[PDB]
Design a protein around this ligand. Structure first.
Ligand SMILES: *C(=O)/C=C/c1ccc(O)cc1
Length: 125
């Protein structure tokens, strides 16, 4: 395992050192998005939660293509305000229900330490 707790205050500094292989050792799902919502990184734990194959969703748009259930003011709306503002740090519960059994999760969205990238972290509840 990589030992990093979900919700940790300095998580963006810790994850700045990991490559795709290290990200697969986290105890929670991790997605890195660009400012348009395209998927740059997608770890093994997220694929275990949602059924998606990580290598197949990199490059797709999360809000348009992969996760239309998140295209709502409650999820995408928060993301886009964060990108526009250049700051984002929010945690909320959500249900993922597209082409899968409805699954309740906790989501943490946080701006990355690098400029135009954003993390989405997911764990079951
Ligand atoms: C709603 O459409 C949610 C879909 C979804 C969430 C998270 C993922 O990693 C993949 C699909």
């Amino acid at each position: 395992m990589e030992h990093v707790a979900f919700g940790s205050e300095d998580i963006e500094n810790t994850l700045a050192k990991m490559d795709d292989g290290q990200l697969d050792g986290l105890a929670f799902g991790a997605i890195q998005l660009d400012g348009d919502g395209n998927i740059l990184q997608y770890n093994a734990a997220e694929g275990d939660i949602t059924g998606r194959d990580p290598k197949q969703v990199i490059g797709k748009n999360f809000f348009k293509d992969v996760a239309p259930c998140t295209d709502s003011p409650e999820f995408y709306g928060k993301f886009k305000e964060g990108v526009a503002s250049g700051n984002l740090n929010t945690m909320f519960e959500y249900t993922f229900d597209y082409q899968m059994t409805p699954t309740k999760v906790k989501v943490h969205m946080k701006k990355a330490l690098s400029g135009d990238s954003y993390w989405v972290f997911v764990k079951r509840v």
